[model samples]
Target: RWLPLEANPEVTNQFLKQLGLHPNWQFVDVYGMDPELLSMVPRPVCAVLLLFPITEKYEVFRTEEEEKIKSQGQDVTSSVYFMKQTISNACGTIGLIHAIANNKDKMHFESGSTLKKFLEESVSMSPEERARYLENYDAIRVDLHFIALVHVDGHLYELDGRKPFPINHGETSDETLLEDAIEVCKKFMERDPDELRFNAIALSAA
Candidate 1:
């Protein structure tokens, strides 16, 4: 059975290390995405990963809005690396994929690592096909409360396993990755403005 657990980089970093992820990569704890909390993060942040509560109200709007976007013709994901969560606890791994995959030249995976092998081969497969391989990969046997905020192909994308694909927030670049992500993240927090449930964190190479 799939164990949907909570995984943050503090512990997952160790798992990632054993899997041969680049040594330079690290995780930064972000209390919030607001300027104050974000300013505390180390620079050159490669990705923003957050773990939030799943509220019935949020899902209600999420579903309805996704359909609205689909009908309006703005829910396209054909231009980026998108995937579905095919197995339990794979969200963390999937988030990492979304992070480093986009920063290929910046982060180096140790030789023969699961990530390296998959990236090299999966380059040609469709997002869905790649997701299938991801679930059984055995590397990141990690969890659900994981979601990633990353800059992909000049856009800010939210990588949540529960979603159909990576949700495109808006445009972004290396210089603006952190800023753009924070902006979108703020919007998410605003959705649950009164929430005292979830905490946030970030990933970077320091």
Candidate 2:
């Protein structure tokens, strides 16, 4: 239900390039590179994706807080779109979905393409419905959990399959989205600096 795994920026770059994602946006590997490689990454990143260790502790805490807020009737005003993950081995798929969906303005979907069709279908589908669509459409998996971040509704939102909602950090604009995203990615690294399993990649314009 709430589990399963990974990607390259390897197959990811190729996948995005062919799957009707915006032409210029690409998937790149920064999984275990040096600072020189890290510092010279593409600028104005459209999305930042993190593949990390999702311990049971965090999931339990996440569930508790999500339920606590729901029971209290919390409502979001930013039109955030999210749903609990239902597919296994589909986090990278899910992350790419957010990476593409959030950048519609600069993206391209060829006529009648699978992804193009799904993107259109998703317009009216509930978050659950979208997840179902992906479950049926994708059959991939891994052990490491993945989550992505993008600027939406003038705020920073974390897109994750396990989360009940997209996590909002604070105000974000086009100008600062990349900088803000990198900072958030940094925190994830800091939290598990010693843990060798982590990848932070970006989708950016050419």
Candidate 3:
């Protein structure tokens, strides 16, 4: 099971200490869009993008596995789970950040567009670079699923869903993505005026 830093900071910190990360290492906060809002905005569901590193051994194994399956006519899809676990075990700090972001209320979004922009700025990577990174590193995946527990007008709504936003190098303009997320949030707001509370969106690449 993944550690829940947002829900249990002390325990998470202790765990990090055991992992050799400095106790003072900061976890950044992120937000997700309200799913209810997405239905009306024609935008993607807002979420977070996490980056994890993989070891050279894991990388070599992954590449060799891919080649072997291609040559031996064995199914490759089933290996994904094992590969993911191996990479996660070796280096998976990104997930911890996502957990922290998900639990914070300050980064919640009203739209997918805003979330997309945040991702673009935070990574400081161009779309081409992002695509290249994804292509070369199987362990460096992005997660885009997030659920927001929002409190509005004394009421609460759990807004969660996947977004349709595509991250192609040429097609996805950061501005456009942010607008889509905003639309989603606006729609949710219309459904329940009380569910507007949000701090950040949380998600990771997987």
Q: Top lDDT: which candidate number?
A: 1
Candidate 1 has which clashing residue pairs, if any? 89-142
Better of 1 and 3 by TM-score: 1
- lDDT comparison, 2 vs 3, better candidate: 2
Candidate 3, which ten residues in sequence have the lowest lDDT sum? Answer: 76-85
Error of 3 at 107 (Å): 21
Off by over 4 Å in 2: 1-4, 31-38, 64-79, 138-142
Instruction: Give lDDT tens digits, candidate 2, residues 154-199.
Output: 8888888677677666778876776687677776666566766777
Answer with 1 or 2, whichever has the higher TM-score. 1
Error of 3 at 157 (Å): 20
> What lDDT does the true structure give each of the candidates?
0.70, 0.68, 0.32
Clash number for candidate 2: 2
TM-score computed on alpha carbons, candidate 1 = 0.86
Question: How many steric overlaps are in each model, in order?
Answer: 1, 2, 31
Better of 2 and 3 by TM-score: 2
Candidate with best TM-score: 1
lDDT of 3: 0.32
TM-score of 3: 0.23
Please identify model 1 stretches exceeding 4 Å from their true place.
1-7, 75-79, 139-144
